């Protein structure tokens, strides 16, 4: 009966490093490979490396480069990855799997890794809506955006700016500092909010207006922007 | 992750009737001919296969002698046995592939004359 | 007259690295910032990092640690931006902007790097469709997988593996070398193809057949996974 | 990426009757004072803001007369001037803190008694 066990679901902050294990039993450790397959939410599954645990010969896919270190007991038929230097984009899923050099057939119930916020390296993440805005000529229109973390900076400034990209051109910036209109950017384009909500307000939209709308902040390294926001007549 | 008992090499003189060339699986575990497949390459090409799903083995031409014991397989043992004459006319080295449903390993013996 | 200029669009394989420039005219190019940010095709805007052409400092993004440097020529107003290593994520449109520590303003025209085939390291860009497949019990199924390049290892054996992820569970194996059936699986499920194009086929879908599908490919490291198929009733 | 020439601290006695803290930016370029923003800061507290597109000036009670000559910003000129009361009242460290569109900065002088 092969069953490989793993260890509980864990939350770091940004900038450490997880060690998950993976206990297998109902086989000879030593005759197989040991897989680590993660998958972000709402992704799919990604291959990060895999051991023989006869003689310790890894397999990294670099990607992973130096982050990344899988380890194997042979006495405890256990194998263990750890991931370093965490950031947003490492929070998944992590599976162990058994099987053999280019194929795996039995996997763990995974391993939940969390990347929270608090630490050094993270990402404030930018969250619009709506991601489609449609809008007739004259109508208003109003772009929320929402922050993870506050946007606020150490000297009081929040760094929130917001850029347009046109189909077929490159962003351009509208405001600067929550609130700043940019030098050629009419009066219908407005700015207002402070902590975590922000938001955009275009009172009259016209047709040269079409495009993607993004968010972003520039108080925290590294800068995030926002999903973006299709709008559209 | 099949570990063989690795020969470097086996000799023969034209006095073998028939040439063995030595495959050895260490950590076999199959209960069954059918999760496994062996492949026999000789200087590159494939001149000896074996489907243990659908129960059928292949061979070129030039190497209609070429064949192995099955019932040994899931013991480990997937020799290539041939005649005299495949035998001189093919010397040099072999590759023994064996896989066994996800696992999977090789090993080179070379066939020298004396 | 503030205008930023991009070097042409570069085509490379996996591994290598690119350096692409950014001509700045219409402005003293020593009291600015140059920041360079990416955009994947169909995603957002993501910043890479910043200099300072007056004293050199840079300040990058750690998800590009190692891998991406950025220069500054003041007698030729002219920002760099060298990322090496490439691996088929880094497939974007790259822009530098000018701005402050904290904003952008103005942007270049963009440039494209596309990560092409035949280098050690690149994904083998794994395809399904269709993305979602309906299906009444009884009623036969087929999922298609297409890969960038050939499967066929240097052993002559195609290293094609499909698996199924049932809504709740962990990844189980279904297919392995294309056509070869796992041990518990059903007769229903068949596996085919060769080259680039493969095909799993089910011929009598039942109720706990409903999950997600994955092709997969262990013949050229990273080891990559198909997009998805989602079955459904 | 507005520069400063810095100057570590400098003193005063209770014959100044006005006091002046030096703030100057080298590299500013700004044609129009509505395109900069100042923000003078004693120990994490704004005791003097200037926003230069409302043309507007606002300081907390102990600092009533906090105010810089805003037609030396283009010059690249943010100096805080005081008189002696709010000086003797408030010495140590000042941030001054300029802006102009997207560019900005900052320096550090303390305001040391003899
Ligand atoms: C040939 O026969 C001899 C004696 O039976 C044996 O020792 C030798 O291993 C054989 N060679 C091969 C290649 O089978
Ligand atoms: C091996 O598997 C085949 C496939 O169904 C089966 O017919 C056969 O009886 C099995 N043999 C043994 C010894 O289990
Ligand atoms: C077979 O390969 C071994 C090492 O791989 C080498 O020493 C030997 O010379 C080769 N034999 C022939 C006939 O090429
Ligand atoms: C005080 O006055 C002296 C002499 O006029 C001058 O050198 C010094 O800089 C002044 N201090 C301040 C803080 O203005
Ligand atoms: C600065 O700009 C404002 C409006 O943006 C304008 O009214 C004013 O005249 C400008 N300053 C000068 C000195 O012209
Ligand atoms: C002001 O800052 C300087 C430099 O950081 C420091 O040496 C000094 O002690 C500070 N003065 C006060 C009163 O905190």
Redesign the interface.
């Given at each position: 009966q092969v069953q490989l066990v793993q260890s509980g679901a864990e939350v770091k902050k940004p900038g450490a490093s997880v060690k998950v294990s993976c206990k297998a039993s109902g086989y000879?450790f030593?005759?197989?490979?040991m897989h680590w397959?993660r998958q972000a939410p709402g992704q799919?599954?990604?291959?990060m490396g895999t051991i023989?645990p006869?003689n310790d010969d890894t397999?990294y896919?670099?990607?992973f480069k130096?982050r990344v270190t899988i380890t194997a007991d042979t006495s405890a038929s256990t194998a263990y990855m750890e991931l370093s230097?965490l950031?947003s984009?490492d929070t998944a899923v992590y599976?162990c799997?058994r099987?053999?050099?280019?194929?795996?057939?039995?996997?763990?119930?995974?391993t939940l890794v969390t990347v929270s916020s608090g630490g050094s390296?993270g990402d404030i993440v930018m969250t619009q809506s709506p991601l489609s805005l449609p809008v007739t000529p004259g109508e208003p229109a109003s772009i929320s955006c929402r922050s993870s973390q506050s946007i606020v900076?150490s000297?009081?400034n929040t760094?929130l700016?917001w850029?347009l990209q046109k189909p077929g051109q490159?962003?351009?910036?509208l405001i600067?500092?929550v609130s700043?209109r940019?030098?050629g950017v009419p009066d219908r384009f407005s700015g207002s909010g402070s902590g975590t909500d922000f938001t955009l307000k275009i009172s009259r939209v016209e047709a040269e207006d079409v495009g993607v709308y993004?968010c972003?902040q520039?108080?925290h390294?590294?800068?995030?922007?926002?999903?973006?926001t299709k709008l559209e007549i | 992750?099949?570990?063989f008992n690795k020969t470097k090499s086996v000799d023969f003189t034209f006095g073998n009737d028939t040439v063995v060339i030595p495959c050895f699986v260490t950590?076999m575990?199959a209960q069954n001919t059918t999760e496994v497949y062996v492949k026999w390459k000789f200087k590159g090409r494939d001149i000896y296969t074996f489907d243990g799903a659908l129960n059928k083995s292949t061979v070129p031409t030039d190497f209609s002698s070429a064949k192995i014991e099955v019932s040994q397989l899931l013991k480990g043992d997937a020799s290539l046995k041939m005649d005299k004459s495949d035998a001189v006319s093919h010397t040099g080295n072999y590759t023994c592939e064996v896989t066994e449903?996800?696992?999977?390993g090789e090993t080179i013996i070379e066939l020298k004359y004396r």
């Open positions: 000879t030593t005759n197989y490979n397959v799919r599954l990604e291959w023989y006869g397999s896919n670099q990607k130096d230097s950031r984009e599976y799997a099987g053999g050099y280019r194929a795996m057939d039995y996997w763990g119930q995974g390296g900076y000297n009081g760094y700016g850029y490159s962003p351009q910036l600067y500092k700043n940019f030098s993004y972003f520039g108080s390294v590294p800068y995030t922007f926002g999903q973006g | 992750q099949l570990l950590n575990e449903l996800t696992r999977e």
